[PDB]
Design a binder for this molecule. Structure first.
Ligand SMILES: CCCCCCCCCCCCCCCCCC(=O)OC[C@H](COP(=O)([O-])OCC(O)COP(=O)([O-])OC[C@@H](COC(=O)CCCCCCCCCCCCCCCCC)OC(=O)CCCCCCCCCCCCCCCCC)OC(=O)CCCCCCCCCCCCCCCCC
Ligand SMILES: CCCCCCCCCCCCCCCCCC(=O)OC[C@H](COP(=O)([O-])OCC(O)COP(=O)([O-])OC[C@@H](COC(=O)CCCCCCCCCCCCCCCCC)OC(=O)CCCCCCCCCCCCCCCCC)OC(=O)CCCCCCCCCCCCCCCCC
Ligand SMILES: CCCCCCCCCCCCCCCCCC(=O)OC[C@H](COP(=O)(O)OCCN)OC(=O)CCCCCCCCCCCCCCCCC
Ligand SMILES: CCCCCCCCCCCCCCCCCC(=O)OC[C@H](COP(=O)(O)OCCN)OC(=O)CCCCCCCCCCCCCCCCC
Ligand SMILES: CCCCCCCCCCCCO[C@@H]1O[C@H](CO)[C@@H](O[C@H]2O[C@H](CO)[C@@H](O)[C@H](O)[C@H]2O)[C@H](O)[C@H]1O
Ligand SMILES: CCCCCCCCCCCCO[C@@H]1O[C@H](CO)[C@@H](O[C@H]2O[C@H](CO)[C@@H](O)[C@H](O)[C@H]2O)[C@H](O)[C@H]1O
Lengths: 53, 177, 63, 459, 606, 168, 99
């Protein structure tokens, strides 16, 4: 099969996918002040959970 | 441009050059043709007045005096032939004198547009290829035994042989391409 | 030289022309949003502060 | 930022796992796509700078440099595709790995939040660049050039390490946001002056100041084309970026500690620009042009007005692109005539008519053609310095004249004049070279359309 | 108003059309020169309309097209300032460029790359129009510097000529030395007024405005070739004759005068500036008229005539007469372009000869060209009621009846007469004496692409002066009361110069040798300014750059001081320390010294 | 076009008042331009505006609630100092735009008045001068690293100077 | 002399494969590489990158700045206030050092 060497094409896009996931994790850890900042603090709208998730 | 300068010049060459330069400057000074003729005849009279001087020391002194007078009286802005060095359009066409070795890089599709010319060119390249060996040997054999050399090159002596070092002399771009 | 120019023009147009066509169609039909005062009692979405439809689409789907 | 770093790292596995045939194509393509991905950092619709995590951040000052770095790597690969034509596969892949590593480290450096990130990722650039110069260079003196390049920077850097450690001991941290938001005034003690110097000297050396600029004319005329491109497109700007980020703490000492370096910059600019007039090496001429431009950048940064900062950033980017293009062009002619003398090859407009067009455009960018961002930067720096002291216009004008002069001198000497007809080996321009020049010019034209992107933090 | 602004923008769009067509494959399939000529014709026709609107209601517009960037409280908008100056000059420039672009096809039929030549001429036209219709100082700079680049490319179009390459770099030198002053003006008007827009700059009338107006004067000197930076224009004729006709006479060189006219409101108060301009204009007029005489090249004579005319405009501005100076700009554009075209016709018909010594009897052989040349000369030396007279006469009137530097006035009048003298030089040696050209006559001017353009410019030279003068709105109160001699001073001096020139030229047929003369040499060699400056300044500067900078300091002293000193010292120290004889006796002796030193340190430190 | 923020005096065009038998070319050129160019262009524009009426959408100008100034921040409290600093930056650039608007007013006034600008633009020149004095006293001599704290320090220096002058 | 290879003779790459795009010896790899370069660079990064950058909205919220400035100016002009007060920080807030 030509996958023999066309498998290599999945590395870089996998790099992008993995980087995006890790960015989401990085933003997860920094949750405090999620909605506790003077400018932007608000009461959540009805039927809502997280402001910026 | 077609002959190499000598090691030096004799009195004859120097005086002739001075004659030509002075006549042209005299013309540049005297715009009208009749006036130019009037004064050029006097100039030839002066030049020939000392034509036969067999004391070369006095001859050289006379020539030096003539040259200094020339430098004193030279037209500040002389007449320059359009193609002559220092004249407008001296090198005006050197942009388009692209050489012949460029054609070797033409794409075959470009060569297709001109079929016959390139066939003739191929003949010419074949001729040059053949003649190089003989012409190099010719120069090597015609080299002077002594250590005295001149720029002037030899002619074709044998039969069916191209003149030595001819590719650059021939094939040079046309004056007005 | 001619080949380079020709290929460059072709490959720039390949996506330029479709993209300019898309921009023109969006501008002519979809149109640009217009300023309004926030309806009191409403929490506008983050994208809803951008004028252009393309800008707001990108905002909503990717920022 | 980790959506840009990780693909860059993954380029390396691709480079080494690709088949020998498709390696160049695959890495070039995926590097272009990484460049595309890097544009996400331009979605700054608010004044709050981006901070992607505790480690990586971006700003108006760092986004343009990061995007430039991403853009350069594909062009570096294209420029290197040729002179590596007949090397063994592992050696070619080593070169490609070196370039990828350089991109990774430079992006991380520009996106670093703590100055002791920056001090490590900044000097880590020395290894790949040193290898590129010394291993793949042509002439013999490349070893000496590598030694100069390494040690000038290391001597500059060690005092930076000492100063940074002192800073951390005194403040408690080295996160640049925290330093900015808790800075305090320095006092004019001798120890504080020594600090100021320790903080500023490494960056000033990397921004070769007139007296410490001997490592550029060597590194460049001994380095291959890709080395020269990355060097005098990004490495030289490391110094400016460091200076901009770090000067915030070092106040108010600057008011009188800048007189020496402002003077050295404003004089060495004239001296080097003049040197460009009578230099017989095209690579050297370009290098000294770069030195003059960085002299301007240093003067503006060391006067610190809003115009100074914004124009310095604009000119940083503009010089990056323009010098890169000039070096690619010179390497184009070098790959054929195998010489670096400017006099040797002449009248090449008679055989490379389009590359002559690219030459002309590059020379215009160099000489600062309005409305080009090159001019905009130089003009705004000039306005700043004139405000600082109305007499600097004399030096600025002399430098402008000489800049135009050597910029046109290159063109007249090479492109114009009788074709050196004896050059049989001159071959038609490669589509690779033409595309490389186009990729250098087009970003310049688009940014001239949209200058707002490349302004600094101030404006 | 829609029509006016729409037409203004459409002019530029039309002028860009040939460029875009050039960057396409349709250039091969179309007759590009004719397409560009047609575009220029249509652009001129469009421009006529805004001119009519202005002549009617005299309403001037500030049109802001695109917002290029905002720089912390200094927007940069692509602005256009349409008014008397801009509108009339756009009309005139388009007319003259229409004529010269049609004539370029004839003069350059044989040459390849004719398409590139036409493209470059068009590009110049766009850039100069940007200069004229510019509100921002930055945009005005775009025009200022882009016309400089186009001049570089057109001069030395034949990049084979080393001489033409030097001429292009000469132009860049002098223009950039000028542009230093322009950048100074920009920076000053940015710091002190915080805006590059002319409307906002106007409110600086109550400041000193010396530091900026000096920059403006220097930039104008450089670009318009006033005395200080004059050599570039006369030797800018190495380029093609159409380029000389258009750029370096009719349109480009008027850039400095145009800039000063634009900034007339600020310079009204600064007497120092006005007197400086008066003196500079007078000096340039006299100097370049002296050089104009005793010059044997048909194109260089006209080049020096152009420099003299520009010096006259400088005087016109030196006295507070901006409108009249601009009127002279526009009026002279016509007949200067016509004279250049006639000279080009002569040069082409003869074997590319440009010396007026190898031209003669042209009036008999080329009736059309000689007739138009005579019209051009009579316009240059304003004969009553031709285009020149409807400007130059009023200029001289104001000069003779305004408080002025006495010397400046005198040399200006002498140069006015001397213009007649050198115009006679041409009309004589090129059209009146018996032939001098090579025998093989091959003269054809019957080509319509040559006849019609020159016809149009001759009709311009014969009527446009009166039409413009009568239609333009009142601006400056002219002085009309004066003595008889002052009133007819210009005519008497011009006619006297003509007669003197006729006497002198007729004296040449006398069968006597003309001898080298100090004044003749001073005139012919161009005052020695080239020979001296262009041989001392480049040499000194370049020698310093190689020796003091590159060699003495950069390649020698810096290397010795910083790298090599360190390298030496460290090598000295390694050769001092490492070389040990390798004997345990000596090594343990050193260990003993360490013993003693530690003991001593312990003891003293306690 | 909010005429308030962008004041624009009224138009006062005069009567045709023709006194010539000849026809004015401008009126006929304008009629031809109207009919030929304006009419089709207006048709196109009306079609686009109908297409916009369909698919109408709204965008809202963002409102930023006020937060404590740097004066209310305890030294070294980065958490509050960040918010105070960002607020100051936004106010800074809003002031920049104020200056731009007033400068545009001045330029438009100059162009409108023409040669009467030396008298009829006095009002806008006065407004420009006052606002530029305010801008200078607010943000000038602040380094490229301008910040709320530098602005506060500058203001306090000037207030100390004024207090001294009042005392003396 | 030491045993070292002679310097290689120069090459003309247009002698073979007259359609040399400058990228590789093999014509197939060469053309595919050129296509990849042009496509991913010009037909992607430049075009899509330029469109994205062009349609980034409210960059550094400049338009928001202008809109808010217009609103504030209208407010101040209607209410009669000075457009800008020379004191950014209200002096009442500041506890100016007492002597
Ligand atoms: C307000 C602001 C106004 C700004 C104006 C500022 C003026 C500055 C003056 C600079 C003077 C430059 C100059 O002298 O000419 C250089 C250059 C030399 O031309 P040439 O001598 O005919 O070259 C022929 C080659 O030697 C031999 O090849 P060829 O004969 O086959 O050429 C055919 C044709 C083929 O051309 C093409 O194929 C063009 C393809 C363009 C792709 C552009 C993509 C953009 C992507 C956006 C995303 O020409 C070219 O190849 C030129 C390619 C390079 C064009 C790059 C675009 C530069 C735009 C400058 C802005 O001429 C130009 O192309 C410059 C364009 C004109 C200047 C700008 C005027 C504004 C027009 C805007 C539309
Ligand atoms: C009767 C027949 C009437 C005929 C007229 C018909 C009009 C019509 O059909 O509807 C027009 C309709 C607009 O209707 P609309 O509702 O009024 O417009 C909505 C927005 O305004 C839409 O605005 P937008 O944001 O979508 O505009 C798109 C933008 C296109 O841009 C892009 O979006 C990116 C495209 C990248 C493509 C890459 C390939 O077009 C531009 O704004 C022009 C680009 C900038 C060019 C000028 C740059 C000058 C630089 C100056 C440098 C010189 C120095 C200055 C010195 C002065 C300072 C001192 O659609 C269009 O706008 C045409 C499509 C635009 C294509 C332009 C692409 C050029 C690249
Ligand atoms: C009362 C009023 C008094 C006014 C006094 C004004 C004094 C003159 C100011 C202008 C200075 C110009 C200096 C050099 C001019 C020059 O040499 O350029 C043209 C010349 C071309 O040579 P050319 O003689 O025309 O050739 C004939 C045929 N071979 O050039 C050349 O041949 C080679 C040129 C290469 C030059 C490169 C090196 C730089 C040249 C000096 C730059 C000076 C910068 C500082 C200027 C400060 C003063 C403004
Ligand atoms: C930012 C990082 C820079 C780093 C250095 C460069 C290396 C990176 C290369 C990346 C390659 C992609 C290039 C991305 C930059 C594109 C610039 C751009 O197109 O900006 C959008 C431009 C301006 O639009 P606009 O916002 O209206 O400007 C006025 C605002 N008041 O909208 C346009 O008008 C674009 C199309 C105009 C075409 C005109 C062509 C004239 C020639
Ligand atoms: C302010 C602090 C920053 C400044 C720091 C400067 C440190 C720079 C150190 C550079 C050291 C390079 O060391 C370099 O060694 C090479 C060996 O090939 C020497 O090379 C040379 O040596 C001698 C000349 O003295 C010759 O005989 C020899 O043939 C030649 O190669 C260089 O002359 C020296 O410069
Ligand atoms: C403050 C500390 C800073 C340290 C950073 C600087 C590092 C300095 C490196 C010192 C070593 C450089 O090493 C350098 O070697 C070269 C040859 O290689 C020596 O140069 C040598 O060249 C040849 C022999 O090779 C001899 O003809 C010459 O006389 C001799 O000097 C240099 O004199 C020496 O300086």
């Amino acid at each position: 099969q030509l996958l023999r060497e066309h498998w290599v094409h999945i590395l870089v896009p996998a790099g992008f996918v993995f980087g995006c996931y890790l960015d989401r994790k990085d933003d997860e850890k920094l949750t405090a002040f999620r909605n506790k900042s003077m400018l932007f603090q608000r009461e959540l709208r009805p039927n809502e959970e997280v402001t910026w998730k | 441009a077609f002959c190499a300068p000598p090691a030096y010049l004799t009195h004859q060459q120097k005086v002739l050059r001075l004659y030509k330069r002075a006549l042209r400057h005299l013309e540049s000074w005297c715009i009208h043709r009749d006036k130019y003729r009037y004064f050029a005849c006097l100039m030839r009279a002066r030049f020939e007045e000392h034509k036969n001087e067999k004391d070369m020391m006095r001859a050289t002194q006379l020539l030096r005096e003539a040259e200094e007078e020339f430098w004193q009286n030279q037209h500040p802005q002389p007449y320059i032939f359009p193609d002559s060095p220092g004249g407008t359009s001296f090198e005006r066409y050197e942009c388009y004198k692209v050489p012949e070795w460029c054609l070797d890089y033409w794409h075959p599709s470009e060569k297709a547009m001109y079929p016959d010319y390139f066939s003739k060119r191929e003949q010419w390249k074949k001729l040059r290829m053949e003649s190089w060996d003989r012409e190099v040997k010719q120069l090597q054999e015609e080299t002077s035994p002594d250590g005295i050399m001149t720029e002037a090159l030899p002619p074709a002596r044998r039969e069916g042989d191209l003149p030595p070092l001819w590719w650059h002399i021939v094939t040079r771009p046309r004056e007005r391409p | 030289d001619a080949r380079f120019l020709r290929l460059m023009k072709f490959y720039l147009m390949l996506t330029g022309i479709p993209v300019i066509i898309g921009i023109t169609l969006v501008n002519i039909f979809i149109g640009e949003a217009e300023l309004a005062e926030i309806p009191e009692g409403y929490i506008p979405e983050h994208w809803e502060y951008y004028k252009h439809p393309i800008s707001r689409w990108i905002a909503r789907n990717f920022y | 930022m980790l959506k840009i770093i990780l693909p860059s790292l993954m380029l390396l596995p691709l480079t080494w796992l690709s088949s020998p045939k498709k390696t160049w194509t695959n890495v070039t393509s995926y590097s272009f796509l990484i460049s595309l991905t890097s544009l996400t950092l331009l979605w700054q619709t608010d004044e709050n700078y981006k901070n992607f995590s505790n480690m990586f951040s971006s700003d108006p000052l760092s986004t343009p440099l990061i995007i430039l770095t991403a853009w350069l790597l594909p062009l570096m690969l294209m420029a290197s595709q040729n002179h590596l034509k007949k090397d063994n596969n592992v050696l070619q892949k080593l070169y490609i790995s070196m370039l990828i590593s350089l991109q990774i480290l430079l992006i991380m450096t520009f996106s670093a939040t703590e100055l002791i990130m920056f001090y490590i990722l900044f000097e880590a650039t020395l290894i790949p660049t040193l290898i590129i110069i010394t291993r793949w260079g042509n002439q013999t003196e490349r070893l000496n050039a590598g030694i100069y390049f390494l040690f000038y920077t290391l001597i500059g850097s060690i005092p930076l390490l000492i100063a940074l450690i002192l800073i951390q001991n005194h403040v408690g941290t080295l996160n640049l946001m925290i330093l900015s938001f808790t800075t305090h005034t320095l006092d004019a003690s001798w120890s504080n002056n020594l600090l100021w110097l320790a903080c500023m000297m490494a960056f000033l050396i990397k921004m070769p100041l007139y007296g410490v600029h001997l490592w550029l004319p060597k590194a460049h005329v001994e380095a291959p084309i890709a080395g020269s491109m990355i060097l005098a497109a990004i490495l030289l700007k490391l110094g400016s970026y460091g200076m901009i980020r770090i000067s915030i703490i070092l106040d108010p000492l600057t008011k009188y500690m800048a007189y020496p370096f402002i003077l050295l910059s404003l004089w060495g600019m004239i001296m080097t620009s003049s040197i460009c007039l009578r230099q017989t090496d095209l690579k050297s001429l370009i290098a000294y042009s770069s030195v003059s431009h960085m002299a301007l950048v240093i003067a503006s940064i060391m006067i610190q007005t809003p115009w100074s900062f914004m124009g310095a950033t604009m000119l940083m980017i503009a010089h990056g692109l323009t010098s890169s293009l000039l070096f690619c062009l010179a390497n184009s002619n070098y790959e054929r005539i195998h010489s670096r003398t400017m006099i040797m090859a002449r009248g090449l407009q008679m055989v490379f008519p389009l590359m002559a067009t690219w030459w002309l455009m590059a020379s215009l960018a160099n000489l600062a053609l309005p409305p080009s961002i090159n001019l905009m930067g130089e003009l705004f720096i000039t306005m700043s310095l004139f405000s600082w002291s109305n007499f600097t216009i004399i030096l600025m004008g002399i430098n402008i004249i000489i800049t135009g002069m050597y910029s046109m001198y290159m063109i007249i000497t090479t492109q114009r004049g009788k074709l050196t007809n004896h050059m049989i080996n001159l071959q038609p321009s490669h589509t690779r070279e033409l595309t490389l020049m186009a990729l250098h010019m087009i970003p310049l034209i688009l940014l001239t359309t949209s200058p707002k992107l490349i302004t600094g933090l101030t404006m | 108003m829609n029509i006016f602004t729409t037409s203004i923008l459409l002019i530029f769009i039309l002028l860009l059309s040939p460029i875009l067509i050039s960057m396409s494959n349709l250039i091969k399939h179309i007759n590009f020169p004719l397409y560009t000529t047609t575009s220029i014709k249509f652009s001129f026709i469009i421009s006529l309309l805004p001119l009519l609107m202005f002549f009617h209601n005299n309403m001037e517009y500030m049109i802001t097209t695109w917002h290029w960037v905002t720089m912390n409280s200094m927007e940069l908008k692509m602005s256009f300032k349409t008014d008397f100056f801009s509108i009339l000059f756009t009309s005139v420039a388009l007319f003259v460029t229409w004529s010269i672009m049609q004539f370029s096809s004839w003069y350059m039929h044989s040459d390849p790359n004719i398409n590139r030549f036409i493209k470059y001429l068009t590009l110049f036209l766009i850039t100069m129009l940007i200069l004229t219709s510019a509100n921002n100082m930055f945009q005005l700079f775009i025009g200022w510097e882009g016309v400089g680049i186009m001049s570089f490319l057109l001069i030395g179009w034949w990049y084979g000529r080393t001489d033409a390459n030097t001429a292009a770099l000469q132009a860049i030198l002098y223009n950039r030395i000028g542009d230093i002053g322009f950048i100074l003006a920009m920076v000053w008007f940015s710091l002190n007024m915080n805006s590059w827009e002319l409307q906002q700059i106007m409110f600086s009338n109550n400041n000193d405005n010396l530091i900026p107006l000096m920059g403006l004067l220097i930039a104008a000197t450089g670009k318009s070739a006033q005395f200080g930076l004059h050599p570039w224009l006369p030797s800018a004729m190495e380029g093609p004759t159409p380029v000389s006709a258009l750029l370096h006479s009719s349109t480009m060189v008027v850039a400095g005068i145009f800039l000063l006219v634009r900034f007339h409101p600020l310079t009204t108060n600064n007497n120092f500036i006005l007197t400086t301009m008066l003196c500079l204009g007078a000096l340039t007029t006299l100097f370049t008229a002296i050089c104009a005489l005793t010059q044997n090249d048909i194109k260089k004579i006209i080049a020096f005539s152009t420099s003299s005319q520009l010096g006259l405009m400088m005087v016109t501005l030196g006295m507070n007469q901006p409108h009249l100076a601009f009127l002279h700009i526009c009026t002279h554009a016509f007949f200067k372009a016509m004279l250049f075209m006639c000279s080009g016709s002569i040069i082409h018909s003869l074997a590319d000869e440009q010396d007026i010594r190898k031209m003669g009897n042209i009036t008999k052989i080329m009736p059309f060209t000689s007739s138009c040349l005579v019209i051009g000369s009579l316009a240059l030396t304003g004969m009553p009621f031709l285009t020149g007279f409807y400007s130059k006469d009023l200029i001289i009137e104001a000069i003779n009846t305004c408080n002025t530097n006495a010397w400046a006035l005198l040399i200006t009048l002498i140069a006015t007469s001397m213009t007649a003298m050198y115009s006679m030089r041409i009309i004589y040696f090129v059209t009146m004496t018996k032939p001098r050209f090579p025998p093989l006559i091959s003269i054809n001017e019957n080509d319509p692409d040559l006849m019609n353009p020159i016809k149009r410019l001759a009709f311009g030279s014969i009527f446009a002066g009166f039409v413009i003068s009568y239609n333009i709105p009142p601006t400056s109160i002219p002085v009309l009361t004066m003595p008889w001699f002052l009133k007819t001073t210009a005519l008497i001096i011009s006619v006297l110069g003509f007669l003197i020139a006729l006497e002198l030229n007729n004296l040449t047929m006398k069968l006597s040798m003309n001898k080298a003369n100090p004044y003749s040499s001073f005139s012919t060699l161009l005052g020695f300014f080239p020979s001296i400056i262009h041989r001392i300044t480049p040499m000194k500067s370049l020698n310093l750059s190689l020796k003091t900078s590159l060699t003495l300091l950069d390649l020698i002293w810096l290397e010795k001081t910083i790298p090599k000193s360190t390298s030496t010292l460290h090598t000295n120290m390694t050769t001092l320390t490492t070389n040990q004889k390798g004997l345990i006796k000596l090594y343990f002796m050193s260990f003993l010294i360490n013993i003693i030193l530690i003991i001593i340190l312990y003891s003293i430190n306690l | 076009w909010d005429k308030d923020v962008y004041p624009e005096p009224p138009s006062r065009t005069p009567a045709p008042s023709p006194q010539t038998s000849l026809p004015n070319p401008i009126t006929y050129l304008t009629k031809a331009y109207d009919l030929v160019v304006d009419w089709p262009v207006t048709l196109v524009r009306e079609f686009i505006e109908r297409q916009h009426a369909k698919n109408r959408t709204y965008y809202y100008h963002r409102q930023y609630r006020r937060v404590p100034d740097i004066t209310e921040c305890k030294e070294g409290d980065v958490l509050c100092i960040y918010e105070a600093e960002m607020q100051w930056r936004r106010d800074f650039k809003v002031d920049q735009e104020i200056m731009n608007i007033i400068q545009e007013r001045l330029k438009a006034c100059q162009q409108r008045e023409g040669e009467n600008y030396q008298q009829n633009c006095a009002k806008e020149l006065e407004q420009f001068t006052k606002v530029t004095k305010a801008y200078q006293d607010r943000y000038l001599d602040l380094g490229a690293y301008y910040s709320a704290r530098k602005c506060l320090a500058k203001q306090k220096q000037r207030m100390l100077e004024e207090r001294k002058a009042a005392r003396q | 002399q030491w045993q070292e290879d002679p310097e290689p003779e120069d090459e003309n790459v247009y002698a073979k494969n007259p359609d040399f795009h400058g990228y590789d010896s093999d014509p197939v790899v060469d053309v595919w590489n050129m296509r990849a370069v042009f496509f991913f660079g010009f037909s992607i990064v430049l075009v899509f990158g330029t469109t994205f950058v062009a349609y980034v909205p409210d960059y550094r919220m400049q338009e928001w700045a202008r809109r808010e400035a217009e609103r504030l100016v209208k407010y101040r002009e209607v209410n009669g206030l000075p457009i800008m007060e020379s004191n950014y920080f209200d002096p009442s807030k500041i506890q100016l050092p007492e002597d």
